[PDB]
């Protein structure tokens, strides 16, 4: 009765929307910005993070946000790690979360930046192209939806050197579901806490 199935992801459970867009962070034009949105009624969250003593801006941001145990949204980019970018890089992370919160609030759901997790992946040491990312943020809020393809797009948008996306969902016989997406093909030896 319980089914673990590939080709389904973050939008398999009820109460989630997702999308992925090409924001021009990647020179190639590929999808590079993902959004995962919790529709409620509950907003419980937990998180674990690299034990690397060098942590990127988005890790430092999200570690702080998770102390609340509450999330409305996760915004994730590929095409740059925003890592070893110092206080200015952290300001960009904060600006991304604020932009997601503002776009969601305008869209109809009152959200503060502290309710938005931020993840990045890609080259270490470059700052993010903020004009492109912020334009992408507005776009992706208007593309998100509960359908399985919304999950697919988000899974594709987080890819860097990956050739295929990674998704799975567990459908429990008691009628609840856990969905997941992941990426990572190199610099891949997690040690999480």
């Amino acid at each position: 009765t319980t089914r673990l199935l590939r080709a389904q992801g973050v939008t398999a459970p009820a109460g989630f929307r997702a999308a992925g867009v090409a924001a021009g962070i990647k020179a190639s034009g590929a999808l590079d910005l993902a959004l995962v949105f919790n529709e409620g009624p509950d907003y419980a969250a937990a998180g674990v993070f690299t034990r690397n003593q060098v942590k990127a801006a988005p890790v430092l941001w999200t570690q702080q946000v998770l102390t609340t145990g509450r999330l409305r949204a996760v915004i994730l980019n590929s095409g740059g790690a925003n890592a070893c970018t110092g206080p200015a890089g952290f300001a960009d992370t904060h600006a991304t979360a604020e932009a997601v919160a503002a776009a969601l609030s305008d869209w109809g759901t009152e959200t503060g930046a502290i309710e938005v997790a931020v993840c990045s992946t890609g080259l270490i040491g470059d700052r993010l192209p903020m004009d492109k990312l912020l334009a992408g943020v507005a776009h992706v809020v208007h593309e998100m939806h509960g359908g399985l393809v919304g999950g697919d797009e988000a899974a594709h948008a987080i890819m860097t050197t990956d050739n295929v996306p990674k998704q799975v969902a567990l459908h429990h016989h008691d009628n609840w579901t856990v969905g997941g997406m992941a990426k990572g093909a190199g610099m891949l030896a997690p040690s999480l806490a």
Binding site: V10, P41, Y43, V48, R51, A81, C84, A182, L188, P190
Partner: protein, 198 residues
């Protein structure tokens, strides 16, 4: 970098999610080791909408999160940079579970083991040289090494194997306890090198 987002419509408080996540990450992502380089950005998040209105027994919530994470780890391993072999290093017979994990990682990260594997070579000598450097309880005269279920080294010497296929299991028993652990890894290929240098 490994990023992962998990979602659920199970009704669960943050503490319930934290347990499920920390157990799953210990057993899965923490034992996925492709190239031994841990990133500055790894993140795993687990969100609950509670849209089902069903609070699972914690054990069932933990098991569901584990199954998803473990399958994601399988998918990550299968698409690793330059992968030609999908390698599992199992260490059994260690003094402690942590000893087994340390031994398995030592073997999985070793550059001569990984290149032997790329070459489809059941090179137990390189496995022993590697595991001999692990900072754990070890008796060289009690070690066995198997490739795809075939014992090639027993009691720390050659036994009195076709590795052409992509799936390879290396199993090393240390004969000093009951601790066991398993690491998902891959081989070190020209494709890895080219992707990371060019």
């Amino acid at each position: 970098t490994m990023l992962c987002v998990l979602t659920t419509d199970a009704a669960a408080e943050p503490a319930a999610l934290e347990r499920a996540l920390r157990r799953a990450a210990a057993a899965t992502f923490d034992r996925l080791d492709i190239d031994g380089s841990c990133s500055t950005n790894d993140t795993v998040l687990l969100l609950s909408s509670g849209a089902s209105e069903i609070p699972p027994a914690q054990a069932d919530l933990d098991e569901a999160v584990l199954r998803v994470c473990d399958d994601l780890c399988a998918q990550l391993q299968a698409d690793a940079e330059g992968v030609t072999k999908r390698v599992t290093v199992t260490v059994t017979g260690a003094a402690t579970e942590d000893d087994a994990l340390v031994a398995a990682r030592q073997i999985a990260r070793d550059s001569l083991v990984k290149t032997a594997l790329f070459g489809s070579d059941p090179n137990w000598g390189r496995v022993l040289a590697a595991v001999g450097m692990a900072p754990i309880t070890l008796d060289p005269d009690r070690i066995s090494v198997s490739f795809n279920g075939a014992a090639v080294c027993v009691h720390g010497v050659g036994a009195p194997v076709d590795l052409s296929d992509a799936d390879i299991d290396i199993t090393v028993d240390l004969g000093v306890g009951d601790g066991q652990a398993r690491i998902r890894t891959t081989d070190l290929s020209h494709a890895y090198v080219e992707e990371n240098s060019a």
